[PDB]
Amino acid sequence: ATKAVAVLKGDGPVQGIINFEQKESNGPVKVWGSIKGLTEGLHGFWVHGAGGDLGNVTADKDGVADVSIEDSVISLSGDHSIIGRTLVVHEKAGAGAGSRLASGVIGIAQ
């Protein structure tokens, strides 16, 4: 089964791993991961280049904002592929200003 993984990196301690599931074109691809480091708050996470729609995430007291979205016909490939994409987490979603703190390109994990 073809899978993918992308790690986040910014100030240093901030991390963010996102695993994917792509067995076949017929099979969907659900996105999910966990961003640790930052503190409780809001950090709009998404994938620039591939929809860029992955809702927002709220950090925890320990400093971990779990991420969970729905699967699409992307199939981790094709026109709607998210392999090698560019991830970016805003400083504080809700306003709509725009800023780049961390980043983590997607990479097939087989």
DSSP states of 43-92: --EEEETTT------B--TTSEEEEE---BTTTTSSTT--TT-EEEE-SS
What is the three-class DSSP state of 1? coil
Please name the method used to determine this structure. NMR
Distance in angstroms (rounded) separating the CA atoms of residues 21 and 10: 26
User: CA torsion 77→82→84→86, rounded to 10°?
Assistant: 160
Distance in angstroms (rounded) separating the CA atoms of residues 28 and 43: 26
The pair of structure tokens assigned to 12 is 């240093």
